[PDB]
Design a protein around this ligand. Structure first.
Ligand SMILES: OC[C@H]1O[C@H](O[C@H]2[C@H](O)[C@@H](O)[C@@H](O[C@H]3[C@H](O)[C@@H](O)[C@@H](O[C@H]4[C@H](O)[C@@H](O)[C@@H](O[C@H]5[C@H](O)[C@@H](O)[C@@H](O[C@H]6[C@H](O)[C@@H](O)[C@@H](O)O[C@@H]6CO)O[C@@H]5CO)O[C@@H]4CO)O[C@@H]3CO)O[C@@H]2CO)[C@H](O)[C@@H](O)[C@@H]1O
Ligand SMILES: [Mg+2]
Length: 293
């Protein structure tokens, strides 16, 4: 559903494995005590400051409290909420940080976001996939059975491809016929659903235009026309989705017949089978990542 997080019911979480918890945000310094009691040695926080300010959480008091103890480490590795693109872009570095933390700290690892429904499950699932050796859909089935969430499989598949093959960007042009509009924006795409970017009305063209450089993948977006959310009937669209919403999408493709394009196709299937040389390459990347601080 649309609004499932209930901050007032306090920090909540599930063991995915005995050594790996996915949970919602710590709310008070005393929540550090709760995690120490179950053998948590790393608190891996994905929230940004506005997420914390929205719910009145004082992250500084939590960090200061955790520093009193030598048997738990609090780490901030920030990812924007409601932004599958930022998630795709951040996953490699974030999982690298987590990889180094778990190696150094051991015990139980507590991976959290605001709700523990999007970013934290995505990060934990990517860690199970790249580090712990699970097949992606094997880990996904396990995760979904332990905690109801929305773990952003498309972001994970794309981050994996980004590490293995690199990012190739091209100019994408989105356009909307004017019907006496004062303002036209797009949300979603590469900026997230919490953000909007204005289009320009072409002088004497009768059309609003946006040009953006995007890497390969499929990007859902929607127009805001004088403040009203609208999908453009003249561009590709998908839905209604679960939540009853229809979005436009931009499908960006480099070259399907190339070696990298052939790899992308294999890794974009539901359960992307990694070669062992690809697993070794993911670990090589993680090993280069700097430790928290
Ligand atoms: O942090 C502040 C925030 O906290 C709470 O949010 C948390 C929430 O309670 C909890 O459930 C969770 O959210 C989940 C969510 O439940 C899942 O459904 C899921 O959401 C994604 C959704 O399934 C995707 O479709 C997507 O939605 C886009 C649509 O695709 C767009 O079309 C667009 O929708 C607009 C629509 O088109 C218009 O016709 C009009 O109806 O307006 C809509 C916009 O309001 O935008 C939405 C996104 O807004 O993307 C969704 C996000 O990925 O996955 C979620 C977790 O990722 O976790 C929340 C914290 O992350 C609290 O309830 C909120 O009130 C508060 O703002
Ligand atoms: Mg190459």
């Amino acid at each position: 559903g649309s609004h499932m997080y209930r901050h007032e019911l306090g920090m909540n979480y599930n063991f995915i494995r005995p050594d790996l918890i996915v949970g919602s945000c710590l709310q008070t310094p005393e929540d550090v005590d709760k995690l120490r009691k179950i053998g948590v040695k790393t608190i891996f926080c994905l929230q940004q400051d506005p997420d914390l300010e929205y719910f009145g959480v004082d992250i500084s008091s939590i960090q200061a409290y955790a520093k009193k103890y030598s048997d738990i480490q609090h780490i901030r590795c920030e990812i924007r909420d409601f932004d599958a693109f930022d998630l795709r872009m951040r996953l490699p570095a974030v999982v690298g940080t987590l990889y180094k933390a778990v190696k150094r700290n051991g015990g139980v690892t507590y991976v959290h976001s605001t709700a523990g429904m999007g970013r934290a499950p995505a990060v934990a699932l990517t860690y199970m996939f790249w580090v712990q050796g699970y097949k992606l859909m094997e880990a996904h089935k396990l995760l979904m059975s332990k905690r109801s969430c929305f773990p952003k499989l498309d972001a994970i598949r794309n981050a994996t491809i980004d590490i293995l093959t690199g990012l190739k960007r091209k100019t994408v042009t989105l356009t909307l016929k004017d019907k006496g509009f004062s303002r036209v924006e797009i949300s979603g795409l590469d900026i997230g659903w919490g953000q909007r970017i204005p289009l320009t009305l072409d002088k004497g063209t009768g059309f609003w235009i946006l040009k953006r450089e995007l890497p390969e993948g499929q990007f859902e977006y929607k127009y805001i026309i004088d403040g009203e959310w609208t999908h453009n009937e003249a561009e590709p669209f998908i839905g209604p989705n679960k939540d009853g919403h229809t979005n436009n999408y931009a499908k960006v493709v480099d070259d399907p017949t190339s070696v990298d394009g052939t790899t992308r196709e294999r890794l974009s299937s539901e359960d992307p089978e990694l070669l062992e040389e690809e697993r070794s390459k993911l670990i090589q990347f993680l090993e280069t990542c700097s430790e928290a601080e």
